[PDB]
Amino acid sequence: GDRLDALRDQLQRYETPIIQTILARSALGGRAPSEQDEVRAALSRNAFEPSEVISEWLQTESGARFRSTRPLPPAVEFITPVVLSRDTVLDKPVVGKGIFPIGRRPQDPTNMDEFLDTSLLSLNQSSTVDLASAVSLDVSLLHLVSARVLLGYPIALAKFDWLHDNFCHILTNTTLSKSQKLANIIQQLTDHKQEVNVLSRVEQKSKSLSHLFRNDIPYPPHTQDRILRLFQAYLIPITTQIEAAAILDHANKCT
Amino acid sequence: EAGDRLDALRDQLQRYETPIIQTILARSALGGRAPSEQDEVRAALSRNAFEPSEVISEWLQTESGARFRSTRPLPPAVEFITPVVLSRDTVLDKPVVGKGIFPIGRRPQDPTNMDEFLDTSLLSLNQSSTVDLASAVSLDVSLLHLVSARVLLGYPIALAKFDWLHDNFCHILTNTTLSKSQKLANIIQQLTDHKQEVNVLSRVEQKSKSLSHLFRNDIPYPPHTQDRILRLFQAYLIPITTQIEAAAILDHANKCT
Ligand SMILES: [Mn+2]
Numbered sequence: 001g002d003r004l005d006a007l008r009d010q011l012q013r014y015e016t017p018i019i020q021t022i023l024a025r026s027a028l029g030g031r032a033p034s035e036q037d038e039v040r041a042a043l044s045r046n047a048f049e050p051s052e053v054i055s056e057w058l059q060t061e062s063g064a065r066f067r068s069t070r071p072l073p074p075a076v077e078f079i080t081p082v083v084l085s086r087d088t089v090l091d092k093p094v095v096g097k098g099i100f101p102i103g104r105r106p107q108d109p110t111n112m113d114e115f116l117d118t119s120l121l122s123l124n125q126s127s128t129v130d131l132a133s134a135v136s137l138d139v140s141l142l143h144l145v146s147a148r149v150l151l152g153y154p155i156a157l158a159k160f161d162w163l164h165d166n167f168c169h170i171l172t173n174t175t176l177s178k179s180q181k182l183a184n185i186i187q188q189l190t191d192h193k194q195e196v197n198v199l200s201r202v203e204q205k206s207k208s209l210s211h212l213f214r215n216d217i218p219y220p221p222h223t224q225d226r227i228l229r230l231f232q233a234y235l236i237p238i239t240t241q242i243e244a245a246a247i248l249d250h251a252n253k254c255t
Numbered sequence: 256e257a258g259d260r261l262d263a264l265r266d267q268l269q270r271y272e273t274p275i276i277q278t279i280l281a282r283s284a285l286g287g288r289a290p291s292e293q294d295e296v297r298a299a300l301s302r303n304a305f306e307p308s309e310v311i312s313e314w315l316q317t318e319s320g321a322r323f324r325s326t327r328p329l330p331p332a333v334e335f336i337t338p339v340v341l342s343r344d345t346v347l348d349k350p351v352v353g354k355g356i357f358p359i360g361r362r363p364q365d366p367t368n369m370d371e372f373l374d375t376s377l378l379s380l381n382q383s384s385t386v387d388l389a390s391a392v393s394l395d396v397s398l399l400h401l402v403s404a405r406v407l408l409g410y411p412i413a414l415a416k417f418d419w420l421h422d423n424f425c426h427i428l429t430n431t432t433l434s435k436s437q438k439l440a441n442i443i444q445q446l447t448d449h450k451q452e453v454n455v456l457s458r459v460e461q462k463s464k465s466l467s468h469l470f471r472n473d474i475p476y477p478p479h480t481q482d483r484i485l486r487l488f489q490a491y492l493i494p495i496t497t498q499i500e501a502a503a504i505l506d507h508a509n510k511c512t
Contacts, residue, residue: 010385013474017281020466021394024277029270045302048389073389128267130404132305132330136397137278140390144285147387201470209277209466213458217270 004158007151011239012198014148018235019205019227021144022119025137026223030126032134036117039138043071048143050074054150062249066242068113073146076112080104080237091203091228098192100199103237112145112234119226148235152242159189160247167247168254185244195236202231261415264408268496271405272455275492276462276484278401282394283480284473287383293374295392300328300399307331311407319506323407323499325370330403333369337361337494348460348485355449357456360494369402369491376483405492409499416446417504424504425511435505442501452493459488 032038047070049055057063058074068077083103093099109115120138160167170176170184206224289295306312314320315331325334340360350356366372377395417424427433427441463484467476 009472009474012472013284013286016284016473017390017394020277020281020284024274024281024397027270027273027277029267042303046299046389046393048392130400132303132400133274133397133404136393136400137274140281140393140397143387143390143393147390205470208468211465213461213465215269216273217266 001158001162004155004162007155007158011148011151011155014144014151015198015202015205015231016209018141018144018148018230019202019209021137021141022227022230023209023219023223025134025141026219027217028134028137029129030124031120032126032129032131035120035131035134035138038131038135039142040071042135042139043073043142046139047071048073050150054153057153057246057249060249062245065245072113073142075149075238075242076116076142076146078112078238078241079110080234080241082106082108090232091225098196100196100232102192102195102232104233108229108233112230112238113142115230115234116141116145122222123220145230145235149239149242152239153246155239156189156243156246157250159243160250160253163188164253171248171251171254182244182248185247186240189240189243189247198236199228199232203228257415257418261412261419264412264415268405268408268412271401271408272459272488273462275398275401275405275487276459276466278394278398279484279487280466280476280480282391282398283476285390285394286386288377288380289383289386289388289391292388292391292395293377295388296395296399297328299392299396300330303328307407311410314410314503314506317506319502322502329370330399332403332406332495332499333399335369335495335498336367337491337498339363339365347489355453357453357489359449359452359489361490365486365490369487369495372487372491373398373402379479380477402487402492406495406499409496410503412496413446413500413503414507416500417507417510420445421510428505428508428511439501439505442504443497446497446500446504455493456485456489460485 050058050073054063054074058067066075066078068074080103082105084101084105086105086107088101088105089097091100104110109118116138166188167185170181170188173181176184203224206227210219210224212218307315311320311331315324323332323335325331337360339362341358341362343362343364345358345362346354348357361367366375373395423445424442427438427445430438433441460481463481467481469475
């Protein structure tokens, strides 16, 4: 239970660095020629392998869904299914529905890699942006999103040790398919009030960190919306799927 | 054309300011120092093959520009040492009667160059086994690229100033009684606008305070993080940029004919 608090603080810790790193890239300038290819090349020459515990997990059946094509870091290719409709209101109270619904609409790019790439492609091409600075910030961001969702794994273990019976009841239910177990584990793990607590704080960080000081160049259009979207459509739901996969991966604890 | 060229370069200069500040904050919010962080950073800089533009690469091989070449694999200008010009007790960020505010350049206790200033900042963190090494290293690398490209704008800025204020510069450069060292010093003084320095440093300081607030349950920044951000601009970015511009003006004295 203490282990879990400390993990929650570690998770929250990624918010500000992720927001500032996106804002740094957005303020720097437009997109460099071949930036995307240069990002892939940098990743390839500076590969940071995951911890032993995660590497092993990523070779299992359960874990392999979060292994990306080299040289991309873990989980940035993972595709959550569409769960919202096209016209879902994202950041405003809707009667009967609450606020900040999670997950992907049919128009949201498939995964974090495509999402981040789409944001870069939304910028004007620039011949004056420095390639090395731009690439290195893009790479930093890819590492930061991957490490954030990967916290889902030790978080899950600590949630398991804490609510052992709630999860074991599900994991030893022989009537349920693999599909229905996963889902019931996800619903145990889902706390929409905590989601709203994260997202409202992300929205408020994005606003106060994107402030413009006198004679600053404005950020590109939609920059704050896209930062909110990264958390609400990708970071939160991917992290939940990771947690549930970790719980399934440790069903032997119920015996 | 020249007035427009210079305005376009001045905007390009200002576009580094927020990115430098946000990158320092991102790294300082993220966590303490990983084992082997500093060795990881130098190794990553060895593995890339970015090269400066043709104009810069050529200027770095001249007598005038070769002072901004760093030891490999560091990017240009990050080892360059400006002279101590302030005194130990100089007050940095408040008005002082008869001395204004935000005096520029290094005191004797400041680190000699950007490389040492940023390494020393990193060594002030506690060691951490939970900080993500890849994210940490990548942000450290991003800041080193950023500060180097920022100061390297001094070179096209100076050529655009020269094409505008031709007579004031040539007046120094054709003075055959002046040594190289006096000329350089006169050119630096001609390029210096303290009023503009004060404008940038006031806004740097406001950014560093406004962008470093905390929300409930956030982990604090390390102590002196705002002071360090201001120090990077005041003692290094601004003076090194002026030195690069001066050397470029010197490098183009043929244009006085
Ligand atoms: Mn080397």
